[PDB]
Design a binder for this molecule. Sequence first.
Ligand SMILES: N[C@@H]1[C@@H](O)[C@@H](O)[C@@H](CO)O[C@@H]1O
Ligand SMILES: N[C@@H]1[C@@H](O)[C@@H](O)[C@@H](CO)O[C@@H]1O
Ligand SMILES: N[C@@H]1[C@@H](O)[C@@H](O)[C@@H](CO)O[C@@H]1O
Ligand SMILES: N[C@@H]1[C@@H](O)[C@@H](O)[C@@H](CO)O[C@@H]1O
Ligand SMILES: N[C@@H]1[C@@H](O)[C@@H](O)[C@@H](CO)O[C@@H]1O
Ligand SMILES: N[C@@H]1[C@@H](O)[C@@H](O)[C@@H](CO)O[C@@H]1O
Lengths: 149, 149
Amino acid sequence: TTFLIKHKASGKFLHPYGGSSNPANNTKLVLHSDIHERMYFQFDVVDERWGYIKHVASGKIVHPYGGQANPPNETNMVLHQDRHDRALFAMDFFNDNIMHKGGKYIHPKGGSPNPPNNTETVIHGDKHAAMEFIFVSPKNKDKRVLVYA
Amino acid sequence: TTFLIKHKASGKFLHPYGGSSNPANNTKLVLHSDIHERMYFQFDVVDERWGYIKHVASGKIVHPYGGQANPPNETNMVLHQDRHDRALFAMDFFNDNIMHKGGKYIHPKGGSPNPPNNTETVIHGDKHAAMEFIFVSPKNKDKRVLVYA
Ligand SMILES: N[C@@H]1[C@@H](O)[C@@H](O)[C@@H](CO)O[C@@H]1O
Ligand SMILES: N[C@@H]1[C@@H](O)[C@@H](O)[C@@H](CO)O[C@@H]1O
Ligand SMILES: N[C@@H]1[C@@H](O)[C@@H](O)[C@@H](CO)O[C@@H]1O
Ligand SMILES: N[C@@H]1[C@@H](O)[C@@H](O)[C@@H](CO)O[C@@H]1O
Ligand SMILES: N[C@@H]1[C@@H](O)[C@@H](O)[C@@H](CO)O[C@@H]1O
Ligand SMILES: N[C@@H]1[C@@H](O)[C@@H](O)[C@@H](CO)O[C@@H]1O
């Protein structure tokens, strides 16, 4: 299933910085209001809840920058071609968050519920309304879709 | 994906009472320690998180007894052939519970962490450790499997 990753508090979406159809490794992932094919994602299941968040246009996947098993708070989110266990995430569509295998979540940098376009995303352990994400249809940004298959 | 519905606190599983391959309509669902093909389930997705919990051997699904949209506390869980919105559940594999469309959960009747074999299951709104369920492989009762597949 193809979906948009929507920041629940702002309604902005996860994008590669610059919107490239083939972002370079380590391109940052930001929040931006626009919708287009280069901000479509899919989820590739690896092990029950755990899988890779794949940028459809490039085939690169979401990583914490540096690929640590336990990235510290404020580690930037990026795209990278590599597949390994430090690029594993769970798409928690019940609590509305995205959890890295090490236990921390994807956040807007600085914690704003209404961050401006091109706000970077980072790893952080905290849970609050401004780290919530929902996973929605490219054809209807208010309709949740099932990311697991 | 075929799975066992495992009561987390006790390790017992959801069964039709009597363990038939073809339980009659309105047969109660109970907890029981045995594993066999007549306690296998599948989940048929209807709308994103919402779907039918299907008894594989019979093709009947889990209902609140009487088919309420908002079943009261202590309403019995049963199997029934019918498919409708009052037999929709969500299999919350992050919080480890099974939520009915009306917002309440599947519980062992009385809320014991170690209910005896053949304890009835019911709807109840409370959340606690004795209403948690995990969804496991028929080949490995300790291995969680993805039910949304
Ligand atoms: N035109 C795009 C815009 O839609 C968005 O993807 C943005 C993300 O940084 O990059 C470009 O400016
Ligand atoms: N070794 C890793 C690489 O695989 C990737 O996770 C990358 C993501 O930034 O970080 C490191 O360079
Ligand atoms: N308090 C918030 C924290 O929860 C997290 O959102 C962080 C993300 O950078 O920003 C702030 O420190
Ligand atoms: N033999 C079965 C047992 O395995 C279990 O399914 C039980 C559930 O009530 O019914 C019968 O006793
Ligand atoms: N008419 C309903 C039937 O569809 C089913 O939900 C059943 C479940 O017990 O309750 C009622 O008979
Ligand atoms: N106190 C418990 C309640 O939380 C619920 O588990 C209920 C289920 O029947 O049993 C007991 O009343």
